């Protein structure tokens, strides 16, 4: 289990305040959303296990998000100052932080990393006590945060409040978060030539998103000719993924797809 | 729960 937060602050010269968008995930389930451009700048829920929370919870979350937007504006100004970038160009500042949770032993691994214009900028090390800078412009932020002890501030949250929030979110939604949705699988056939056809191994409606799909021929792996696509969200919380292979006609019954998912008691081997 | 805001960049 893991809890993660994704912040995106993009600037816009002349238009006004830079847009700030914050999202929160438990594993592959989004539960919170904040947009500074909305006419109602509040922390809005995205899951049934956070709408149960009272008004105080959302009040604290909302004020934190607004102050974070202010801080990210200041950060964008300082960053365009560091890289000597023009005042007319738009720039994106991303943040990703979160905590992992093992079956026992409290937290497993915490992280808090940043990005400027799509590249690594500064990253909190795994010991949660030191930083790593990508270039010289990030060493300025490194020294600024070493003086202010930003690392200990983030460690107090990751090692403490993050784990407690994650465990609470798990307990108050275990019927939709701690279970597993097995993938519904089938194989489709599509001729492309007089003697060649494509077998497509489908996988629909599974949770979480991580799954293993691979075609094998005569029991041995066939990886160099299988065209796989990225895991696509179905829209109702589930995911989708398929893998296709081109085959000479007649030898189709010898090809076999394997599926590996968390919701299966054993990886399933199926043919067409 | 989201983290608090810290020192600016």
């Amino acid at each position: 289990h893991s809890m993660r937060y994704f912040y995106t602050a993009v600037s816009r010269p002349g238009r006004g305040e830079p847009r700030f968008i914050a999202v929160g995930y438990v594993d592959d389930t989004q539960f919170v959303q904040f947009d500074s451009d909305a006419a109602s700048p509040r922390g809005e829920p995205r899951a049934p296990w956070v709408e149960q929370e009272g008004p105080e919870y959302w009040d604290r979350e909302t004020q934190k998000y607004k102050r974070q937007a202010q801080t990210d504006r200041v950060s964008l100004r300082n960053l365009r100052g560091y890289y000597n970038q023009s005042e007319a160009g738009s720039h994106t500042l991303q943040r990703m932080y979160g905590c992992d949770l093992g079956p026992d032993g409290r937290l497993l691994r915490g992280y808090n990393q940043f990005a400027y214009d799509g590249k690594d900028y500064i990253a909190l090390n795994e010991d949660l006590r030191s930083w790593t800078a990508a270039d010289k412009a990030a060493q300025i932020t490194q020294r600024k945060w070493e003086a202010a002890r930003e690392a200990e501030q983030r460690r107090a949250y990751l090692e403490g409040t993050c784990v407690e929030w994650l465990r609470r979110y798990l307990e108050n939604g275990k019927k939709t978060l701690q279970r597993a949705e097995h993938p519904k699988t089938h194989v489709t056939h599509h001729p492309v030539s007089d003697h060649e056809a494509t077998l497509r191994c489908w996988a629909l409606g599974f949770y979480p998103a991580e799954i293993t799909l691979t075609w094998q021929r005569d029991g041995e792996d066939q990886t160099q000719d299988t065209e796989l696509v990225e895991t696509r969200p179905a829209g109702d919380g589930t995911f989708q993924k398929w893998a296709a292979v081109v085959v000479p006609s007649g030898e189709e019954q010898r090809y076999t797809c394997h599926v590996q998912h968390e919701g299966l008691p054993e990886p399933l081997t199926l043919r067409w | 729960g989201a983290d608090g805001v810290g020192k600016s960049a």
Partner: T-cell receptor, first 110, second 113 residues
Framework: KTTQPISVDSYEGQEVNITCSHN???????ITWYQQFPSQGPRFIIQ???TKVTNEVASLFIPADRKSSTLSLPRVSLSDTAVYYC?????????????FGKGTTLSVSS | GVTQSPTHLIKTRGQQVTLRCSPK?????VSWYQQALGQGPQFIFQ???????QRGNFPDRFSGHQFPNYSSELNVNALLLGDSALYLC?????????????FGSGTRLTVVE
């Protein structure tokens, strides 16, 4: 917010327990205790979250529901006459500052 | 640890006063409290990065300032007789609790008729 007794009477050498009620505590809140001697300012004692905490001067008991707390002084002396404050503080950075309550006035005798 | 100034002082109704506080070495956030006789400390405002970041339930007669060296001043004018109290100053690190709150000895203000 926290509520606690107005005063606690005790004698020298005994163990003193001060109970503090904070039912509407949240997940992102921590517990702390402060001590104020006459004409002085509040002095820190002990803080915690959910487990038993014990330092050189006091002990902190927190039940599972976190809806109460108990500050335990092992062997009180005549120098322990002060006002003890039970506070529930915001755990988030740049959050609400520490808010005090009425406090509990401890009186020890010999 | 925390250095408040002055220790004691006397004022009259309608006058103004400026109290000062120097935080503990290592802290940068300052918070002011008013403690009346018989009651607990009541939060006034918190200053970080030379700006007021949080404020309690006190009128605009109570103003504050913070200097680049984290030192702070509480300027309260038009003193009413109800403003007699011990003014406390607490220092913290970056509006956090890792470096916990540390209060000073206090400033005893008694405004008289």
């Amino acid at each position: 917010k926290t509520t606690q007794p107005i005063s606690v009477d005790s004698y020298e050498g005994q163990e003193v327990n001060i109970t503090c009620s904070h039912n509407n505590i949240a997940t992102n809140d921590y517990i702390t205790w402060y001590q104020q001697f006459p004409s002085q300012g509040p002095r820190f004692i002990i803080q915690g979250y959910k487990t038993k905490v014990t330092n050189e001067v006091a002990s902190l008991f927190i039940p599972a529901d976190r809806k109460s707390s108990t500050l335990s002084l092992p062997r009180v002396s005549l120098s322990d006459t002060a006002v003890y404050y039970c506070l529930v503080g915001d755990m988030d950075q740049a959050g609400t500052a520490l808010i005090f309550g009425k406090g509990t006035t401890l009186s020890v005798s010999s | 640890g925390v250095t408040q100034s002055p220790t004691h002082l006397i004022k009259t109704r309608g006058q103004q006063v400026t109290l000062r506080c120097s935080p503990k070495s290592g802290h940068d956030t300052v918070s002011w409290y008013q403690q009346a006789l018989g009651q607990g400390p009541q939060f006034i405002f918190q200053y970080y990065e030379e700006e007021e970041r949080q404020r309690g339930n006190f009128p605009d007669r109570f103003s504050g300032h913070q200097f680049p060296n984290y030192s702070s001043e509480l300027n309260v004018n038009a003193l009413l007789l109800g403003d007699s109290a011990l003014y406390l100053c607490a220092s913290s690190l970056g509006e956090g609790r890792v470096d916990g709150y540390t209060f000073g000895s206090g400033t005893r203000l008694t405004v008289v008729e």
